[PDB]
Design a binder for this molecule. Sequence first.
Ligand code: HEM
Ligand code: HEM
Ligand code: HEM
Ligand code: HEM
Ligand SMILES: [C-]#N
Ligand SMILES: [C-]#N
Ligand SMILES: [C-]#N
Ligand SMILES: [C-]#N
Lengths: 141, 141, 141, 141
Amino acid sequence: GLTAAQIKAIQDHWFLNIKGCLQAAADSIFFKYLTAYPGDLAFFHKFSSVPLYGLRSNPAYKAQTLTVINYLDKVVDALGGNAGALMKAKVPSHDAMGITPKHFGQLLKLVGGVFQEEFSADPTTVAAWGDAAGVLVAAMK
Amino acid sequence: GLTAAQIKAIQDHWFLNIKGCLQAAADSIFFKYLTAYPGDLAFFHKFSSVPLYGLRSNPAYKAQTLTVINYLDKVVDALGGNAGALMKAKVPSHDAMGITPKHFGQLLKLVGGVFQEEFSADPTTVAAWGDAAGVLVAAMK
Amino acid sequence: GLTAAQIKAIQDHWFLNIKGCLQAAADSIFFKYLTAYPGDLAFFHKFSSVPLYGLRSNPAYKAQTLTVINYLDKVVDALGGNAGALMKAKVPSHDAMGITPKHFGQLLKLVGGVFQEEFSADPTTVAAWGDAAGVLVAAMK
Amino acid sequence: GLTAAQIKAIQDHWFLNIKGCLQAAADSIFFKYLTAYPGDLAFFHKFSSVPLYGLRSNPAYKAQTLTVINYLDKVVDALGGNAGALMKAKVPSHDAMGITPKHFGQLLKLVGGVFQEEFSADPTTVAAWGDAAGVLVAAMK
Ligand code: HEM
Ligand code: HEM
Ligand code: HEM
Ligand code: HEM
Ligand SMILES: [C-]#N
Ligand SMILES: [C-]#N
Ligand SMILES: [C-]#N
Ligand SMILES: [C-]#N
């Protein structure tokens, strides 16, 4: 579930490690998702023919992951409150495309791990991200 | 003064070269400030004993710098809107420390320049940033 | 085994992705090793009491992994030739400390993977690094 | 002219702020050159049609720049040694293109400055780099 201490862990960690280099965190969050779900690369017509090893270098990828991280920044600042409404607002748009809350849960389940592996997240922050994913995907119904 | 073209010029560039690495842009805007105005380092009590050459590496410098650009990010979002009010909302606390609109002008004026030299900004965006400085300072009084 | 095409893959990939940001590659290569072998943190007296999540931010870690990557750069430039002699020269020094070719093989077995995960290494480069580890550890006897 | 103190000043700083991120130092040394001497961009045929503001992002710019700093890294290693000879070893191929020791002096002279503004170099190292420029240019003829 998500308590105010959890919201603090996630937010303190976001100012310290993530907010200052949003592009770096966005590229590794999605790179981890696409090596785990390679076929989902096909939803991104602007770069679905780039091989996996060329994505971090591809500007169409970089603009896309920065568009996502820029919206997640707004969700993290809103975790005490309308974060659930901000996840909600993107379901129509993605639904058009064939992308459900199952795909979103898959992306949100990986960021605790990517933040531990590369962005110096402590165990409390990683566990709080585990909880936040469950919370934020539930907000979409 | 600002036209919709100038606000698109600033916003597109900010998304392109600044948003993905807010810490670098922040470190260099304050480094060009603190180089040009070396005595005002005394105002920054949690790093006023670091010599200039040691600041980009100093953890408290980087916290300060990112707290400024994190706010500035939000006034860029709001340039055809309440950007003015967000700048003026910071004047009474800084006034209490001896830091006037003179000071803010000094900072705001260096930004175009810093973006041209290190963050890939064209002469149109450099121009828009020179005028954005004047608007924001004019809304502060 | 290691052929000249393999040496080309590793070297082309090192100029493209690694040489320009040696510090970033050095911190993730060892971070991956120390999350896999946490107890080996005890060999590094200058930072053995730092928790895992604080290493990427710790200057004593950064200086150490940059000392290692700076020597590996010299080994990669030497892969057609005296690379084996350059690995050889560090066995005495590490032997003093209790660190064998078993520990070195453990570090070299992970860099193909870290380069795929974070430094855009193609499958041919990753497989060539798999071979290079076997080769370079063998050079130490 | 160079004393052992000046060579330690340069080398320690290079290991500290330059070696871990050779690409940034390279991009900015050539960006300060190409800003001060904008016509010599015509010499760089694989990126001579990119306007100045687009160069830090240009892949061929970054390849060129890193090929220079990759070599320069090696002449720093050899400053109490064959640094001179390594600089002069590049004169006949560049002479063939119309690029003289005038040109190299222009580059070498900007380095201290660039390191002071963006790479945390103290006034002693800035001084050592001003003299290293003169020595290296004097060994070239
Ligand atoms: C995990 C949180 C995610 C958020 C907040 C998010 C947000 C966004 C945003 C802000 C856009 C731009 C369009 C708009 O403003 O509505 C976008 C587009 C898109 N995203 Fe999502 N995204 C998420 C998950 C996903 C997932 C999991 C996929 C695919 C597996 C996906 C696929 C796409 C695609 C294909 C586009 C359209 C890109 C284009 O061609 O322009 N996103 N995303
Ligand atoms: C557009 C420019 C600036 C903005 C948006 C800005 C914003 C901020 C913010 C967000 C804080 C934290 C507390 C608060 O919410 O007020 C702060 C604190 C402070 N700022 Fe400003 N600032 C600006 C300019 C300056 C300048 C030019 C100086 C000094 C000449 C300055 C001096 C200080 C001081 C001394 C503190 C440090 C408080 C502490 O010791 O932690 N700032 N700034
Ligand atoms: C994989 C290739 C490795 C290379 C080329 C390498 C190279 C180096 C270098 C150049 C030094 C500095 C001392 C000197 O010049 O001899 C060093 C020190 C050290 N390395 Fe290695 N290293 C490697 C593997 C390891 C491994 C696997 C460990 C530990 C599990 C290790 C432990 C140490 C320690 C503890 C020091 C001393 C640090 C100090 O307190 O100053 N290294 N390494
Ligand atoms: C200390 C300064 C410099 C060094 C060490 C250096 C080194 C190099 C190196 C390593 C190359 C690749 C080929 C070779 O091995 O010779 C090269 C090529 C080239 N350099 Fe220099 N360079 C320096 C200064 C300059 C300057 C100041 C200019 C022009 C005003 C310049 C113009 C060129 C040109 C045009 C090429 C491009 C070849 C191609 O089109 O790929 N360089 N440089
Ligand atoms: C979503 N991208
Ligand atoms: C304002 N700092
Ligand atoms: C070896 N460090
Ligand atoms: C020389 N480029």
